[model samples]
Target: LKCNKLIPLAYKTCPAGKNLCYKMFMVSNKTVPVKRGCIDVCPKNSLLVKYVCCNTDRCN
Candidate 1:
């Protein structure tokens, strides 16, 4: 599968065994950067961060 890359603003193919595409958001005092990529699983959310995952190509 393919996943989105927010910084480069492009799409990338997921590595073997990593079917989940993920997008992450962070909360800072005022703001935070966005991130996207491929992952085997979505990690647990932290106090300042959140993770979103999908199985389709470029789904992040």
Candidate 2:
């Protein structure tokens, strides 16, 4: 249940529909190396970045 703001933030207890930890990695961008949070469904991945979703707590 941990979220992120570039630096890891406090625990985020997911609500009813949100059951996963979502993480995004920007491989080509310099501004943000990674982004993390909670999500309901994992989205698609693109050429410039990657998407990751997990069920365990703070899995992102």
Candidate 3:
């Protein structure tokens, strides 16, 4: 997903077992950036700053 605003890379803070999720933040905007294999590990999308999480195969 391409972004045209500010987006800081983030991830899961606390893990239940042994996995650290990788994700990125958004600001209610859209750009371009395609990827695959992942899951959302954060709060729901926000109009203030959307977010995403990836936790699958070749999803970078």
Whole-model lDDT values for every prediction: 0.77, 0.70, 0.38
> What TM value does model 1 have?
0.74
Residue ranges of candidate 3 with Cα displaced over 4 Å: 1-20, 32-40
Quote the positional error of residue 30 for candidate 3 in Å.
3.1
lDDT of 1 by residue, 1-60 (tens): 888777555888888988888877877521443878889987987787877788887665
- Model 3, 1-60: lDDT tens digits are 221222245322323442323334445333533322233344466675545654443233
Candidate 2 stretches with Cα past 4 Å from truth are 1-6, 29-33
Best by lDDT: 1
lDDT of 2 by residue, 1-60 (tens): 444444655567776787787778887763454777788889988777888778886554
**Considering every candidate listed, which one attains the maximal TM-score?**
1
The root-mean-square deviation over C-alpha atoms between each candidate and the true structure, in angstroms, is 2.7, 3.0, 8.5
TM-scores for every candidate against the unseen true structure: 0.74, 0.68, 0.34
Where is the poorest 10-residue window by lDDT in model 2? 1-10
Worst 10 residues of 3 by lDDT: 2-11
